Amino acid sequence: GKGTPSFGKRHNKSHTLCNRCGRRSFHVQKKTCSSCGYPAAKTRSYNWGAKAKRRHTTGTGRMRYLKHVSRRFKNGFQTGS
Amino acid sequence: AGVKAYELRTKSKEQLASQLVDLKKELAELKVQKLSRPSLPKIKTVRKSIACVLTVINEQQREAVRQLYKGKKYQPKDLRAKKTRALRRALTKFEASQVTEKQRKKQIAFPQRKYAIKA
Amino acid sequence: VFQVSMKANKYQIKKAVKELYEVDVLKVNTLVRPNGTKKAYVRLTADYDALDIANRIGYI
Amino acid sequence: EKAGHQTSAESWGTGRAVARIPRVGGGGTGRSGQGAFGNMCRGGRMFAPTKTWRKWNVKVNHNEKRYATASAIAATAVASLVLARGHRVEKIPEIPLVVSTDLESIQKTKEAVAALKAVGAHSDLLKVLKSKKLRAGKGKYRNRRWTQRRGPLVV
Amino acid sequence: AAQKSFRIKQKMAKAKKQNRPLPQWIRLRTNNTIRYNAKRRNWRRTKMNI
Amino acid sequence: NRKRPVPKGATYGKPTNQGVNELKYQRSLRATAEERVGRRAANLRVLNSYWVNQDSTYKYFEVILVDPQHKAIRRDARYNWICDPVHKHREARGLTATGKKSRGINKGHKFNNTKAGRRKTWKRQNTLSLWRYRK
RNA sequence: UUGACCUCAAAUCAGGUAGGAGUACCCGCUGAACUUAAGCAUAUCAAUAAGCGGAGGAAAAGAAACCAACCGGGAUUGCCU
RNA sequence: AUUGGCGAGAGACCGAUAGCGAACAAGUACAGUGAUGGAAAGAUGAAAAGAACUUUGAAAAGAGAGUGAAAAAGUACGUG
RNA sequence: CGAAUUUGGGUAUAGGGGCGAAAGACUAAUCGAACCAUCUAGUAGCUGGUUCCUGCCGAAGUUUCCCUCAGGAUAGCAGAA
RNA sequence: UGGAGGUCAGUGACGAAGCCUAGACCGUAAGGUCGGGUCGAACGGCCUCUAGUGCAGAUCUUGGUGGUAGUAGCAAAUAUUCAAAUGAGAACUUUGAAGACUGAAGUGGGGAAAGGUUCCACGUCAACAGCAGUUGGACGUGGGUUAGUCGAUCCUAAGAGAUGGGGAAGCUCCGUUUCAAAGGCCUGAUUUUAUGCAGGCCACCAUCGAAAGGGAAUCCGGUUAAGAUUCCGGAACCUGGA
RNA sequence: UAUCUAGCGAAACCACAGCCAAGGGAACGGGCUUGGCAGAAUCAGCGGGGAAAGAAGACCCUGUUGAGCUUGACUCUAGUU
RNA sequence: AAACUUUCAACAACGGAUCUCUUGGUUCUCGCAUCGAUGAAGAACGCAGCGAAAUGCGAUACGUAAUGUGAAUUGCAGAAUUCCGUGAAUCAUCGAAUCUUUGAACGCACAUUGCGCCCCUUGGUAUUCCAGGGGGCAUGCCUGUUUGAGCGUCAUUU
């Protein structure tokens, strides 16, 4: 049986959590994340994957630094009190 | 409402360090009480007071380092300006306003004149 | 029994208990609880009483 | 332009006892296996989606525009046409109604209202004021909340 | 498994503390439409698959 | 030449595109030389390059580069133009002499396809321009 | 017994810089096929989609190794034609 | 030039199966090993005044009573 | 049923590719070329459907050409002005 | 039919729009108008403008709902019975008593992968356990995992993979010691002078890769609701430090 | 087991439905025509009919629709010489 | 005759159509130019008196500082004359900071919260061992510094 009896045999994760994105997409044997391309320098992205680009892009996170850049520009990148 | 930064800023290093230590002791005792008591909102202002003391200490240290590096070039990176990466890489006002001597002579001799026409 | 900073090790727990409660600790055994926090069992020497020090801290 | 097409739906084909419309693939959503891409489908693209290069402005010959303007001006001097248009000029001595340049030089809204009352356009004013009503549809939440009549045109 | 790694154990702890019903007072807050925890998880129903 | 970097032979393509061997790269050997040099010395800006030698296997070029961050270039306005961000990787964008030659950026009737840019010209003359009052 | 030059190295040497993100528009490379031809191979789609490299507030182009054949215009870029 | 970013003004546009996939803790919940796929879900009332109290029931609840302009608005709530 | 044995884990081989004691077998219930997204709303002389009322007029399955024979152009038949 | 320009100084919280009504009138009809119920904030006539403008079908789409139908069915794995307790309620919970079964390649006691708190204690019907439920791996609230000696960590295996170099327009590919100038432990230096120096040996030729391979070392007794080769008592061992 | 009871409780199918003979009819009717006839509600079986259900026949043909494979097909191509 | 079946109405029933609504979309227009090795975008884990999310934030953790305003916040509860005031606030503004583990991600690794190495301090009668506190150690390239290498080569040598 290629169905249920063979499904009984799947207990070895081919993917684990990825350091760069916590997506369970890090292929263990290939040592590459199938989602972000880790450990390559460039995050994996394709122009046929517009939904994927939406999921992984600027503004989908906290923007811990980039959120204040517009305010600082609007103020002229001032310094002082 | 906790301590106030304007009255913290006059205090010295030893006094601020002692205040931080006793604030930490009070916070620890308050965590102990919070374990036994349902609502302990005083822990809120105790944590706030610890933060105020820490920021006053840090501001004093950073001002001291700024005074130590005053005047001389090569200030520490955390102390020098932050504007943006590109704003830091851009040519300074002096460097951008630099012109060659040929163009300097040309600009002196033939500037854009102020003229009007009426009749 | 203590809740301990996750980044602390037995050396730091020993030193911090000594410096906070002025007691001599015999052994430190740590674990990471299923809620993700460090739990330390600090056994003191026979010179000190855990119930004495617990009443000093404030919890009976 | 991408509304109704943000999907990877493929037709299941024949032999599965369902219509041949493209269907969303996958599972465990409720959106999976559902019809997509079509005007008949819920969430599908509309038929012939509206485009911005539709003709919006319409060209009219300058001479025809001026012809219509002259006809409208000449209709302003026909007493019966103004009544049919519904302008409450039954208490005006005669039309065309010509007033002095003191009205051109008038300054305050109260004295403009006084000029209108003294001349005979105040009934038209009251018609405009009392005809204000809420619009009769979805135009209220498109910045067109109220509708009223047109009053006099001071030239 | 029993012989876990710290990353997996940390994910376990995060999921365990997340898995709790909505507090009773958030319901009473004004302009509040949240009536229950929609992101609730049971270990039999839905696997985290990490 | 630039051999087409795909066997498997499985293009399912037309015989017009079936060719592999006698295809020619559209940028010059000079252009790829200075691109490699700029990638190596990414902190500099490729000012120019020239031919020095060649054999059957190799062509040899020398690339002139300028440091945009050295103060000897940041001052002295004769060459501080290259310190502006618009000149980042001129070799990569085809703004060097070889780059402009390969892009076809020249005046005249012989360059009607490539004066302001091949793709810019194509976009301009394949756009459908519609006015409010249709002409 | 010494001092230089040339080239090539080393250093947690002094100070810097590059990478990544985003990519609507911009500058290039690479590059199809569905499709049309009522078949189809050149052609078309299309010097397009996908892929790759690189910028800015715009980019690119830009002061003729131009257009012309006229009584000659006169960098570039856009619109109408 | 500008289907991105920041700020602003509009519409003979759509009006919760519409309009962006998402008016809501929406790229969320869940499905896949993975690339990826990807919903459903708005409306009490002006104000909770969200039904004290009495009775039957083990209890849910019912029947009275009560608030309310309306309970032919009772949270499983605008007409339904 | 003591071995061309059975099996865990690790590891290698990736799609016109792999792997095959060879069945076009197996390659995540998918295999005579996997899955995912995109090109793509691919094309379809072919099937299906094509949403209010009343009034007046009212056909053709024939001619010629067509890789033409389930299609079209052309003439005819019909409407309207 | 949805919107738009004019007008009816049109209708309306003294009830608009919607909806229900084998009530009425009008029109050949599309349909329009009104009576009576429901209700709760907007809507219509006319002259024009405009279109995402009219459904019975498309194995149409999305939701909702039927007859079938209280029907098929809930029949594998030998099997349950008596009393008491608890309880509103017991075929199913608990405790006794009996009858049995697995029968030591078990229906026993542990583990690996996987799961992730299901472990353990305390409270009852909403759901779930295709009957029930007072029971539960369910619900709510809490508690629980203690190491020098057990594992990981260290080593290398098949293999993966930086560097030096060479390809490739490039994302990147090869290569793993190759056409490379490829590093680390003892006393002298160890204070008018530093880790600078004729102080010595030299030449692994990154790294990753096993919770079943190799490997330094812990046992007994007791203890918890739930942990123990980990806690306690006793008794040992290994590694590193003048 | 079926069966009856307590509890629990689906699905496939479904234009409308459900008695025949002949006739004619798209040449094998549940309906139409002419006859036979014709009495609520139903239970267990059953497999004659519903040209029963399951699937836009996989055979066959057509389409200027493919794909796998082969070759002295047409046109090319990697390698090699 | 009932039951049953059909049709209609009334009332009551899952259903959520219609109507009205709308802090949402979608198109058009105008203005502007500002990410990152001074560590970005993204990820993980945590932080509230009582809370897990595109709330906010980082062990100074629903935030600190500075500034403005001027009495709140609010579901419940609270340190407090916080109220004619250097002063409430889930306020606004925002120029000072903090900014955990990461990430181009930088000591080497990383399916490990794994291994080093270098300075200074403290503790263990210690420059070597162990531990704690602090600060560091990536690659390519540029300019300069210092130390070098090569009969590649220049001025002295029986």
From Swiss-Prot, chain A:
This protein's UniProt keywords: Cytoplasm, Metal-binding, Ribonucleoprotein, Ribosomal protein, RNA-binding, rRNA-binding, Zinc, Zinc-finger
The record's free-text note on cofactor binding: Binds 1 zinc ion per subunit.
GO BP, sorted A to Z: cleavage in ITS2 between 5.8S rRNA and LSU-rRNA of tricistronic rRNA transcript (SSU-rRNA, 5.8S rRNA, LSU-rRNA); cytoplasmic translation
This protein's record includes keyword Ribosomal protein: yes
Organism superkingdom: Eukaryota
Binding-site residues for Zn(2+), renumbered to this chain: C18, C21, C33, C36
Database matches in SUPFAM superfamilies: Zn-binding ribosomal proteins
PROSITE patterns referenced in this protein's UniProt entry, alphabetically: RIBOSOMAL_L37E
Oligomeric form and interacting partners: Component of the large ribosomal subunit (LSU). Mature yeast ribosomes consist of a small (40S) and a large (60S) subunit. The 40S small subunit contains 1 molecule of ribosomal RNA (18S rRNA) and 33 different proteins (encoded by 57 genes). The large 60S subunit contains 3 rRNA molecules (25S, 5.8S and 5S rRNA) and 46 different proteins (encoded by 81 genes).
Name this polypeptide is given: Large ribosomal subunit protein eL37A
Gene: RPL37A
Curated annotation (Swiss-Prot), chain B:
Residues recorded as bearing Phosphoserine in the entry: S12, S49
GO biological process: cytoplasmic translation; maturation of LSU-rRNA from tricistronic rRNA transcript (SSU-rRNA, 5.8S rRNA, LSU-rRNA)
Pfam families with a match to the protein in the record: Ribosomal_L29 (PF00831)
Coiled-coil regions, chain positions: none
InterPro entries membership: Ribosomal_uL29, Ribosomal_uL29_CS, Ribosomal_uL29_euk, Ribosomal_uL29_sf
Keywords: Cytoplasm, Phosphoprotein, Ribonucleoprotein, Ribosomal protein
GO molecular function list: mRNA binding; structural constituent of ribosome
Chief subcellular location: cytoplasm
GO CC annotations, alphabetized: cytosol; cytosolic large ribosomal subunit; preribosome, large subunit precursor
Compartment list: Cytoplasm
Subunit note: Component of the large ribosomal subunit (LSU). Mature yeast ribosomes consist of a small (40S) and a large (60S) subunit. The 40S small subunit contains 1 molecule of ribosomal RNA (18S rRNA) and 33 different proteins (encoded by 57 genes). The large 60S subunit contains 3 rRNA molecules (25S, 5.8S and 5S rRNA) and 46 different proteins (encoded by 81 genes). uL29 is associated with the polypeptide exit tunnel.
Additional record remark: There are 2 genes for uL29 in yeast.
Family per record: Belongs to the universal ribosomal protein uL29 family.
Protein known as: Large ribosomal subunit protein uL29A
Organism: Saccharomyces cerevisiae (strain ATCC 204508 / S288c) (Baker's yeast)
Origin organism lineage: Eukaryota, Fungi, Dikarya, Ascomycota, Saccharomycotina
UniProtKB/Swiss-Prot annotation, chain D:
Family (UniProt): Belongs to the universal ribosomal protein uL4 family.
Positions spanned in the full protein: 54 to 208 of 362
Domain notes: The eukaryote-specific C-terminal extension harbors a nuclear import signal and delivers the ACL4-uL4/RPL4 complex to the pre-ribosome, triggering uL4 release from ACL4 and incorporation into the 60S ribosomal subunit.
Modified residues annotated as Omega-N-methylarginine in this record: R42
Record's function text: Component of the ribosome, a large ribonucleoprotein complex responsible for the synthesis of proteins in the cell. The small ribosomal subunit (SSU) binds messenger RNAs (mRNAs) and translates the encoded message by selecting cognate aminoacyl-transfer RNA (tRNA) molecules. The large subunit (LSU) contains the ribosomal catalytic site termed the peptidyl transferase center (PTC), which catalyzes the formation of peptide bonds, thereby polymerizing the amino acids delivered by tRNAs into a polypeptide chain.
Additional remark text: There are 2 genes for uL4 in yeast.
Result for mutant: R42E: Leads to a slower growth at higher temperatures but allows RPL4 assembly into the 60S subunit
This protein's name: Large ribosomal subunit protein uL4A
Localization annotation: Cytoplasm; Nucleus
Superkingdom of the organism of origin: Eukaryota
Post-translation changes: N-terminally acetylated by acetyltransferase NatA.
Swiss-Prot record, chain E:
Bias (Basic residues) ranges: 6-19
Gene Ontology MF annotations: structural constituent of ribosome
GO CC, one annotated term: cytoplasm
Region forming the signal peptide: none
Disordered: region residues: 1-21
Subcellular locations according to the entry: Cytoplasm
UniProt KW keywords: Cytoplasm, Ribonucleoprotein, Ribosomal protein
Any single GO BP term: cytoplasmic translation
InterPro entries from the UniProt entry: Ribosomal_eL39, Ribosomal_eL39_CS, Ribosomal_eL39_dom_sf
Entry keyword annotation includes Ribonucleoprotein: yes
UniProt entry tagged with the keyword Cytoplasm: yes
Self-association state and partner proteins as the record states: Component of the large ribosomal subunit (LSU). Mature yeast ribosomes consist of a small (40S) and a large (60S) subunit. The 40S small subunit contains 1 molecule of ribosomal RNA (18S rRNA) and 33 different proteins (encoded by 57 genes). The large 60S subunit contains 3 rRNA molecules (25S, 5.8S and 5S rRNA) and 46 different proteins (encoded by 81 genes). eL39 interacts with YIH1.
HAMAP family, sorted: Ribosomal_eL39
PANTHER family named in the record: LARGE RIBOSOMAL SUBUNIT PROTEIN EL39, RIBOSOMAL PROTEIN L39E
Function: Component of the ribosome, a large ribonucleoprotein complex responsible for the synthesis of proteins in the cell. The small ribosomal subunit (SSU) binds messenger RNAs (mRNAs) and translates the encoded message by selecting cognate aminoacyl-transfer RNA (tRNA) molecules. The large subunit (LSU) contains the ribosomal catalytic site termed the peptidyl transferase center (PTC), which catalyzes the formation of peptide bonds, thereby polymerizing the amino acids delivered by tRNAs into a polypeptide chain.
Family: Belongs to the eukaryotic ribosomal protein eL39 family.
Record gene name: RPL39
